[PDB]
């Protein structure tokens, strides 16, 4: 069994290996990519996204996120607070301001622990979830916005026409701006692209071991546990590296840079956080192996989770017993 240990693999692809994507991720999981939950994918040197970044300042953060925690500094939720538009120039600004911008720092370990340090006593501004691409129309290869869609592909695997469409979401971050524990919609893969600026950090258990992180975080969230039997669909508990180390739970960690991609596997659990003023592109798509994890993905029904048209389909054909009661929680 290749990557037993389930460590993050970093690839290298030649230009010729980028011309196919689906090709390239079937290589590296025969190399064991997936068991890791997370890789990463450094493009050919050849290769760029858009010639520029200079004239993005005009896109609209129409909803930016102040991200509000509650508990301790190892383990706690957040609350997304709304507030008001603002350009990605202005929340650039807001981002370097003495208020928001990154400390002094010696190293990414350095930051790492001055983030779960302090993280609780800050509310960063997040823009978040914001349909759009950053890539040229004229790049042919590893762009998000020209990806096969999962529509098509559970038409390809199960012979099965359904509605729904497939797009990009841009993610500009700032300092401390954080992504909690999650796996995808429908457990499935996600692709993310670092357009620019400062890293982020990630964090991610092995898909073979995300029922262990499951039963951490209904130890630890118990109320939540209560209300919901899926609530990290709710997309806003954290748990630091330190308390998963604590009570055994298998995970990896690694730093994306700009110009980096990530792949997360189905029922990869992930969570990280920004170093800086950043933008990000990411797409979720499928495999024929998803498949089977579409099946037998958890679901939300309390409510919270509220999510796209799209994955109405997708639980309506894979998951029919579930519908009803999953549709229920969506009206
Ligand atoms: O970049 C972020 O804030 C969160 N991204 C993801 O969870 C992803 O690409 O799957
Ligand atoms: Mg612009
Ligand atoms: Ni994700
Ligand atoms: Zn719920």
């Not at 357009?195 to 898909?207: A, D, I």
């Not at 170093?275 to 024929?288: K, L, R, S």
Request: some cysteine; proline content about 5%.
């Amino acid at each position: 069994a290749q990557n037993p240990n389930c460590n993050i693999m970093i690839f290298h692809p030649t230009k010729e290996e980028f011309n196919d994507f689906d090709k390239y991720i079937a290589y590296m999981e025969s190399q064991g990519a997936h068991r890791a939950g997370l890789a990463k994918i450094i493009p050919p040197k050849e290769w760029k996204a858009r010639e520029t970044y200079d004239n993005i300042s005009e896109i609209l953060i129409a909803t930016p996120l102040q991200q509000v925690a509650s508990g301790r500094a190892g383990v706690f939720t957040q609350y997304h607070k709304k507030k008001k538009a603002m350009t990605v120039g202005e929340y650039r600004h807001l981002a370097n301001s003495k208020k928001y911008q990154t400390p002094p720092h010696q190293n990414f370990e350095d930051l790492e622990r001055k983030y779960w340090k302090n993280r609780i006593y800050n509310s960063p501004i997040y823009g978040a979830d914001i349909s759009g691409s950053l890539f040229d129309e004229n790049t042919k290869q590893w762009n998000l916005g020209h990806l096969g869609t999962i529509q098509d592909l559970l038409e390809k695997e199960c012979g099965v026409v359904i509605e729904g469409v497939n797009t990009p979401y841009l993610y500009f971050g700032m300092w401390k701006t954080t992504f909690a524990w999650h796996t995808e919609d429908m457990d499935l893969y996600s692709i993310n692209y670092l357009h620019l600026g400062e890293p982020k950090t990630w964090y991610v258990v092995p898909p073979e071991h995300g029922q262990r992180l499951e039963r951490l975080a209904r130890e630890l969230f118990p109320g939540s546990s209560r209300g919901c039997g899926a609530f990290l669909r709710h997309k806003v508990a954290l748990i630091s590296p330190t308390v998963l180390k604590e009570n055994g739970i298998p995970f990896n960690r690694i730093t994306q840079e700009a110009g980096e991609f990530m792949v997360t596997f189905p029922y990869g659990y992930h969570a990280g956080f920004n170093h800086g003023f950043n933008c990000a592109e990411a797409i979720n798509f499928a495999t024929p192996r998803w498949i089977d994890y579409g099946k037998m993905a958890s679901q939300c029904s309390c409510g919270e989770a509220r999510v796209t048209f799209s994955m109405d389909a997708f639980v309506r054909i894979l998951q029919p017993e579930r519908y009803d009661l999953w549709k229920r929680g969506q009206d």
